Structure 1
Amino acid sequence: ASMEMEKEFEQIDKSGSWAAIYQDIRHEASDFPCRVAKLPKNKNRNRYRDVSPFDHSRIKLHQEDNDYINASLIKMEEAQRSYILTQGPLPNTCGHFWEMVWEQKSRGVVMLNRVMEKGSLKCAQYWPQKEEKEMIFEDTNLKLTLISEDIKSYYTVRQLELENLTTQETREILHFHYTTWPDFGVPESPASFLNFLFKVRESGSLSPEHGPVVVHCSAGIGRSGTICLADTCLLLMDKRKDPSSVDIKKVLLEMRKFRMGLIQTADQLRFSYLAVIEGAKFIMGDSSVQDQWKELSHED
């Protein structure tokens, strides 16, 4: 037996047409204004000139001075799950980043990049690496402490304590850090990707009782778009219990109403199909594949 996304996958593969399929998505994608992102006062808040949040879906900081951060709310109405996608913070926007986490009530942060990739600094060191060296973001009045970390062969999970120094309220934030996913590239296998995504799911960080999970890579679109497409597609299949109801290209186009550029290469699209097709086994009632993925991912 075969799902309809697998029959599509095979026809695209057979005809060698991933590039054309992906370029049609780029051509049909939404174009909305980003006038706030382009104001001169925000030039040093954007990592890449060509990656900006749309005005209509940008996250606003609760700050009277300047409410801008390069971040978008991806609000998936049919799936009933939301995500905040943002760029890797810059040295002058790490306070803004944790202000956003606080104000939006997020429980988890998912980081898909390393700080240094391809010889360049793709992300600021925005969390503490040592328990005894906490960080204070003076501009936004927040304190951030590393509580513990669990290092696996290709990803790390950290427990952070984020404190609002004005109120002295504290919250536990979980940090899921994928350390082997190359920029402009794909994960090593569906299994290791799904093992990581299910670790995020299992944590409870995507619960609708929390604010949206924050997801980022360097730009907040290529790797970030890939994990969110796979997750949303799996959740739609789950609500429905119906793999055939899921149109992956249509879901990606819907996500691109909320942030530009989600999924940056044809191979990341192709990989998204592979991940959804494999994850469908778990959704449709074979929970043992989850142990298979963990074994295939060699976490230890």
Structure 2
Amino acid sequence: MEAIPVKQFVKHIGELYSNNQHGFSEDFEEVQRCTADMNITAEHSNHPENKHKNRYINILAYDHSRVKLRPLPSKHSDYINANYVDGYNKAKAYIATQGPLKSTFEDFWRMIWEQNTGIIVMITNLVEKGRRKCDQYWPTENSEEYGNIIVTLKSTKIHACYTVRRFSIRNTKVKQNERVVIQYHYTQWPDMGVPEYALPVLTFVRRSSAARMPETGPVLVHCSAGVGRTGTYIVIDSMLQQIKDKSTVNVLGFLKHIRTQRNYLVQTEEQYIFIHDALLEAILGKETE
């Protein structure tokens, strides 16, 4: 299980697809098993005081990697369902977290402030197929207040497949001190089935990733549970970095690694395949533009 040279990778993808994606299934089953001999504690996620702070009862934040909120003058005011996740050759390049609940909006923005996060990647619509996926944690227009954090919508650009909102946030208890936070929001989600083409996602990963500023906190990435699409984004982005750096790809190895940092990152085989399609589009896209 070593890195694959980028020039062999698309051929590798052919092989994984063949015979009704038998190879993909092997890979992903291996991913899902890669935790079998690992007990990873999530005591805080399971504490009675924090239960209401978890969007899904089965989706937890591993203790060792969990993002800690600075405590408040409550023993469990430190908790949010969120984990640091490695990027390519970079520890804690991301915070992967659930779509925030109304009840955790203040925690959410406090984390962004405390972690010096400058970019949000939102990979879900608030509602999908009639179902509630995420609560709106930003102002529709002008300003909204969440605890000591006041968020102001400055500008929006609505593209075909995603939306960029530029906020300025201010901490009232500081002096206030103001930061730019940009939210990249992928908006194109089919009423039936799942997204079919990787190219628009590739473009979205490229632009939202290039927006990262030195030297800032980790990029915040969420969907609904903050594992499936969230994991998918992180692997694609990271592998694009590896390709740029070393002209090699290691999807299976990298994914098994980050699976120790938040449960279920890249949740389905179809997402796993999608990662490969995006990288394929990046590889084939070069040398032929």
TM-score normalised by the chain length of structure 2: 0.89
Distance 2:239 2:116 in 1: 24
Give 1:80 deviation, angstroms. 5.8
Matched with 1:71 is 82
The alignment status of 1:113 with 2:124, answered yes or no, reads yes
Distance 2:101 2:51 in 1: 12
The answer as to whether partners of 1:194 and 1:279 remain within 8 angstroms in 2 is yes
The answer as to whether partners of 1:79 and 1:235 remain within 8 angstroms in 2 is no
Distance 1:32 1:2 in 2: 33
Matched with 1:23 is 29
The answer as to whether partners of 1:107 and 1:173 remain within 8 angstroms in 2 is yes
Matched with 1:196 is 204
User: Residue type of the partner of 2:139?
Assistant: P
Distance 2:43 2:62 in 1: 8
Distance 1:128 1:72 in 2: 25
Distance 1:71 1:81 in 2: 12
Give 1:229 deviation, angstroms. 0.4
Q: 1:89 to 1:2 in 2, by over 3 A?
A: closer
Matched with 1:248 is 251
The answer as to whether partners of 1:5 and 1:247 remain within 8 angstroms in 2 is no
1:99 to 99, 103, 110: 110
Distance 2:226 2:192 in 1: 12
Name the SS for the 1:3 alignment partner. Answer: helix
Q: 1:161 to 1:92 in 2, by over 3 A?
A: same
The alignment status of 1:33 with 2:41, answered yes or no, reads yes
TM-score normalised by the chain length of structure 1: 0.86
Distance 1:262 1:184 in 2: 23
Give 1:223 deviation, angstroms. 0.6
Give 1:75 deviation, angstroms. 2.3
Matched with 1:293 is none
Distance 1:216 1:34 in 2: 19
Matched with 2:273 is 270
Unaligned regions of 5+ residues in structure 1, if any?
Answer: 290-300
Matched with 2:9 is 5
2:144 to 113, 135, 141: 135
Distance 2:229 2:191 in 1: 7
Matched with 1:222 is 228
Name the SS for the 2:46 alignment partner. Answer: coil
Name the SS for the 1:75 alignment partner. Answer: strand
Distance 1:19 1:56 in 2: 29
The answer as to whether partners of 2:85 and 2:94 remain within 8 angstroms in 1 is yes
The answer as to whether partners of 1:47 and 1:87 remain within 8 angstroms in 2 is yes
Name the SS for the 1:163 alignment partner. Answer: strand
The answer as to whether partners of 1:176 and 1:200 remain within 8 angstroms in 2 is yes
Question: How many residues get paired?
Answer: 277
Matched with 2:172 is 165
User: Residue type of the partner of 1:38?
Assistant: N
Structure 1 runs of 4+ aligned residues shifted over 6 Å read none
Q: Deviations over 1:129-177 (max 9, x none)?
A: 112xx21113xx1111111100112211001111101111111100100
Name the SS for the 2:163 alignment partner. Answer: strand
Distance 1:220 1:184 in 2: 21
Give 1:216 deviation, angstroms. 0.2
User: Residue type of the partner of 1:27?
Assistant: R
Q: 1:145 to 1:222 in 2, by over 3 A?
A: same
Q: 1:252 to 1:208 in 2, by over 3 A?
A: farther
Distance 1:86 1:238 in 2: 27
Distance 2:205 2:88 in 1: 21
Distance 1:183 1:173 in 2: 30
